[PDB]
Structure formats: C-alpha cells, structure tokens
Amino acid sequence: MIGMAEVKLINIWKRFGDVTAVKDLSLEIKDGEFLVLLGPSGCGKTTTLRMIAGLEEPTRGQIYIEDNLVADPEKGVFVPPKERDVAMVFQSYALYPHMTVYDNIAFPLKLRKVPKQEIDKRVREVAEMLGLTELLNRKPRELSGGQRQRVALGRAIIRRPKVFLMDEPLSNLDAKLRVKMRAELKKLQRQLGVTTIYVTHDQVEAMTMGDRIAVMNKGELQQVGTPDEVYYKPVNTFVAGFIGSPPMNFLDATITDDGFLDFGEFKLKLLQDQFEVLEEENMVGKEVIFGIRPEDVHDASFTHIDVPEENTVKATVDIIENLGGEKIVHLRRGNISFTAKFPKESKVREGDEVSVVFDMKKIHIFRKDTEKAIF
Amino acid sequence: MIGMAEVKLINIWKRFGDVTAVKDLSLEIKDGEFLVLLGPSGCGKTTTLRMIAGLEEPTRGQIYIEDNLVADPEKGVFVPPKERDVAMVFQSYALYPHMTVYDNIAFPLKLRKVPKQEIDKRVREVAEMLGLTELLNRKPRELSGGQRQRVALGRAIIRRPKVFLMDEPLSNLDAKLRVKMRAELKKLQRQLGVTTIYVTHDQVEAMTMGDRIAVMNKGELQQVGTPDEVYYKPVNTFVAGFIGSPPMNFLDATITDDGFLDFGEFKLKLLQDQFEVLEEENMVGKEVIFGIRPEDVHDASFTHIDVPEENTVKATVDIIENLGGEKIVHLRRGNISFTAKFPKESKVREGDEVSVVFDMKKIHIFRKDTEKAIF
C-alpha cells in the first residue's frame, strides 16, 4: 500500500527564466522499485531526475530521501549528491579504451577510496552477474558490441547507493541489443534490490522494464501506475493517447437515458455497470469523449462477441495498412472516423463496406471539459 | 499469367568501377501494375530505376518497354527518357512557393508544350481526384502539411507516361501523413491505370501499396511476388528474414526417417505432406534450416491446436518485451533460442518454464547449403 517512500517530492517546481520545466510535482518512489519517468521530449523528466540527484536545486518544494530532507530552496537546504547517497549512472560515454574490463568496472570505486580487496570482491561479483568473468583482462577493442554494453552496465552498477538514477542509458542503441539490455538491466536491478529511477521517452522500454511508470507531460505528472494500469486505466486523454499504438480512437458521444452512447451516425449499447456509473455521476444526456483502442474494434467476421444493434457498426474502409502480421484498417461512417485491427487473413479491400464490433468491455469515457477519465 | 510485359529487363548489369550495383537482373513488369522494388540501402534498386528511366545506361543487358528496345550498350542503343515515354516523378523538392496550387500542378505540362486548354482540363481533373479543387488559387504557404503533400502528388501524376517511376517519394514524411499518402497514391495509381515502379526500403510501405514486390539484395533479385507471396512463401532465407517483424526464427534440424524434425533439445512432428515433400527430394537424414515466425509459436495456454509430443515444447523465458498490445517472448531450451508472440493477458514472467506450441502449418524448410526454400 504505502509505507515509507524511499524518495518523495512535494510540490516541486523548477523554472528556467520564464520557462516552467517542472510544475507542482508530488511523487513518492517506493523502496526497491524500478520507477520509470516516461514522457515526450521537454516534459521535464530529466530536470526532475537531476533535482533528485542533487545536480540541480528546485525553484520551490521539498525532496526527501528516506524521510531526510535533501532539498528545499526556501529553507537553505541543498544536500550535495554524495551526501544523499543517490548515484547518477550509465551516462553516455565510451568505455575507457586503455583500461581492461576489470579496471573499467573498478574505476568508479577506485575513485571513491574503496579498499583494493573490497573492489576486487565486488568487481568479480558484478562480472559474474553480467557474464564477463572471462573477459576481465580484455581491452574494450577486443569485445563485441554486446559485451561492451555489459561492461558499461557493470561500470554503472558497481556502486551501492540508496538510489540509482539513469537517463535514457540505452539511447541510440542497436535495436536487437537494446532489447537484450532492457532485460539485462532489469534483471540486475531486481537482483540488487536497489531503488531505481529511470528516464526514457520510449513507451516500449518503459512498459517493458518499469515496476511502475510515472507519465509526465509539459512538466506535470499525469499518472503513476504499473504498465497495465497506465495502459488499461489511463486517467485522462493524454495518457490514453500517449500509450499504445496505433493511437486509441477518440469520438464524441452523447449518453442517452436509454443506456446508449449516441455518436450521431450510430449508437453503441453500454454495459449495464458502465451506464450505472454514468447515472451516478449525473452524465445522462451529456456529451462525453468515447475511447476505444483499435485492437478492441473487430472485423465482424473474426469475432463471436457481436450483439446485433448493440455493439456492431457498418462502415467503409478508407485505408488498409498491411503490417504483415496484421492489418490496420481505417474506417469511416459519415463524418466519423475510427481505426480497427483486422487479422492478416482478412480479405478486406479499400472501399469495402464492412461490419465491425466494438468490445464494450474495453472502452473509456472522458469528461469533455477536463478530459479526465470517468473510467 | 504472362502476356506482353510493359517493361522487361534481361540479364541487366551495372558496374561503377569495381563495384557491381546490379547483377544479372531479369525482371518483367506488368502493364498497369504497381510494382515495388524493395530492399536494404545499397541493394541496387535506385540504379535499377534510373536505368529503366534512361538516366543511366546499363553496363550490359537489354531493357524493353512494350517490346521496344530502349537500352543495350553493346548495340549502341540508349533511348533518352523522353523517347521512352516513362517519367521519373515525385522527387524530393518543395512546392514552388511563388506559384499557386493550380500552377504548381500545371508546370510539368506547361514546360512540355501542352495546350493551355488541355492543361486546364487535366489540372482540374487531377485537382478533383485529390480534393484540391477549392485550393487551386492558394499559395503553398496557405496550405496544411497534408494539403501540400497532395499538391506535390498532383504535380507528380499530371503527366501521362507509359510508366511512372518513383524513388522513396514519402521519405522522412510525418508518420500519420505517410500512412494517408500511401493510400492516396495507390488509389490514384489504380484510378489512372498507369504502370508504376516504386522504390522503397520500407517493408510496410511496400506490403501496403504493391500489387507485387521485387525484393533485392546486394544487386540481385531475390523474389518477385504479391505481398502475401513474399510474406508466406519466401524463396530463400534472406527474404524470409527480411520481411516481417519480429524476425522469423531459424533453427538447425535433422529430418528423421520417422517423420520428425530433430532439433537436439526436442523434436517436432512434420505434417504428413511436408514429410512427403522432403522424402521426394531425398532429404531424410539430412540437416536443414527450420523457419517459423514468432506469431506462429503460441503460448500453450492460449491455443487449441496443441498435439502433445508432436508440436509442443517446454522452454524457459529469457526476455519479455511488453509492446502493450502484445508480448514478444524470447525463449530458451538448452542451447536453442527462439521467439514467440504471447497475448497481452499472459501472466508469463522472465525465468518461467512454459509450454509453447509450434503451428506446423506455417513452417519453412531451407536447404543448408544454398539456403533456398524447399517450402
């Protein structure tokens, strides 16, 4: 539920001139979790990470690490990184070419006065965890692209801070290699049990590695939750449209006292409990934003959840994307447009009028004024 | 089947110094089809297109357009582009800023001595086909990104050649816009009925637009066929591994006199007709390359085509990619590695030992020596 947060930000703001990078941010990071700060370029995630590191001071607000105040500009509290016991690691820099794998990994500790024996012990442990034991005496130029990345990882997690901080450490990495590293990095984090805050703008990387994801946009926290929560239960239209591809469909609809969503060109029958939720919030008769992912709009010929006159709609095919393993079909019904996913064996052709089925178990309704989700 | 090819290349070669760009290429393009030349950077597709255009002369070989020889360096035949009646269009250049939409589209014809009246007629027809009629008197800076692309398309297909030639015309285009343009361009090509040869390195664009795709690698034609043929029936391992994502799995296996494929760590039962094909080619007892797409390797818990001891295998999960709408699972069994696609609702975790099912109806067997497909 919620015990003592390993890291806690309270009403944190960061301004650079007349530019607000981070706005009224409150967030609690759990001890031992792998927390990903996900958001588009310029959303304030890097600034947030640097403030937690102690490399930047907040403009206002408080930051705690295990209930110890490490930052509050109004109180003259700005604890240096070293005293916070949080380490910014895996930055974008090549392996030391004139150092062996052993020394590349040992360097961070050697610079921090760790006894030679302790260093040897810790370096070998890390090497074995990354399957580098037999490469210890090799020079960077003697390794393969994959091995080099593992040495860099070893060099990054050899330290034992209270919190690891990383900012897009796999940036521009070879696709195949990046996939292996995402798994490799998360495996180690779990093995070590050290709280990790990871910044990335790559949705797949976030969804793949994070125990939880903190989605940010324009300097504001949108939602924090598990990959499933941010994917299946987005709190607003930004999160709903930011996570998942192709993008979720958004359509205007009016709630009928009859238990239907009226889109004008057609109507869809709400499940009883969804209508119940809407009645309890007095939404009957109001226009809202309807959302459904393309994966939940099915070709009538390839589904058995169809309920005539309740979740089926006839529409015309305007675009067909052949992705090989599946087809992305852009449909149109009057002035309404929505996208669906059709199986690869579908013989649909552009111009065809087809019947699709909306899986009502997977829809979302957002308030049109605040765009926050009702569900 | 095969009547008179609209364009035909015979034993075509193109050398630049000691670099062979195109090697012994023979290809027939059908009248009225949209043929895509697909291949990785440097495969010779652009050189091939330029030779058909008449911008470059072959080093050797013959090129015909409707049974008329337009190129043969050994015979002193090098018909200029204009006399071939094939037009290279939609090159990468901005709309003319000081010209209206009307004139932007009319320019190609105005430069070619087409009567003012004919130009007006043809320009308006093209404008109506692209939904630009009401933008005819606007200047480029008055249009939206999407409209500008349609004007550029109009400027590209206003001419009436025997063959349209295009080289990655949607390069670096806005993703969403590129999807609409692929559909828009193919719609017009079909409307006009003009043979089109389109170069691209984007598999999805090729699969989406092409009536047929000519896959090339290192200057050599690998296969020519419909999107389904190149996807479901690759002639060799290059095509099999080049089209489709994630990449098809390739594993070494020995054919048993018992009708099984022995991978060492496990065995899979071949369907009778597949074994029959292998017996007829005397492959029993030989090692071959087995191929299966990840989409055809299923989580045992989410399939009913499982046949115990014949198409089921227990393996350990090494990597899980959470793509949101699905999970890409990298499995391992001994020293054997293969990837499968698991539904998003799967609760699989890394380290888990799970049972997967191989859909034998979708496999491929390639000769290990030539890597060509038996099926």
Brief rundown of the structure:
Two copies of one chain form a homodimer. The first copy, chain A, is of the alpha+beta class and 375 residues long.
What attributes characterize this protein structure?
homodimer; 375 residues; alpha+beta; Rossmann fold; OB fold (Dihydrolipoamide Acetyltransferase, E2P); six-stranded mixed β-sheet; five-stranded antiparallel β-sheet; 10 helices; 26% helix; sugar binding protein; ATP-binding; Structural geomics; Structural Genomics; nppsfa
Task: Please provide a written account of the structure.
2 copies of one chain form a homodimer. Chain A has 375 residues and is of the alpha+beta class. The first copy, chain A, folds into 3 domains: 2-247, P-loop containing nucleotide triphosphate hydrolases (Rossmann fold), CATH 3.40.50.300; 249-295 and 359-375, OB fold (Dihydrolipoamide Acetyltransferase, E2P) (Beta Barrel); 313-357, Nucleic acid-binding proteins (OB fold (Dihydrolipoamide Acetyltransferase, E2P), Beta Barrel). Chain A has 10 helices and 21 strands. Chain A has helices at residues 45-53, 81-84, 101-110, 116-129, 145-157, 175-192, 203-209, 227-232, 237-242, 272-280, and strands at residues 7-16, 19-29, 34-38, 60-65, 68-72, 77-78, 86-88, 163-167, 195-200, 212-217, 220-225, 249-255, 260-262, 267-269, 287-292, 297-299, 312-322, 326-333, 336-343, 353-358, 364-367. In chain A, the strands form 4 sheets. Chain A has a 6-stranded mixed β-sheet with strand order 7-8-9-3-10-11, with helices on both faces. A 5-stranded antiparallel β-sheet of chain A has the order 2-1-4-5-6, with helices on one face. In chain A, strands 14-13-12-15-21 form a 5-stranded antiparallel β-sheet. In chain A, helix 3 (101-110) packs across helix 4 (116-129). The longest helix of chain A is centred in the middle third of the chain and has 18 residues, at 175-192. Chain A binds chain B through residues 179-180, 182-183, 187, 203-204, 207-208, 227, 231, 243-245, 293, 295, 318-325, 330, 341, 350, and chain B through 179-180, 182-183, 187, 203-204, 207-208, 227, 231, 243-245, 293, 295, 318-325, 330, 341, 350. Chains A, B: GO terms for molecular function: ABC-type transporter activity; ATP binding; ATP hydrolysis activity.
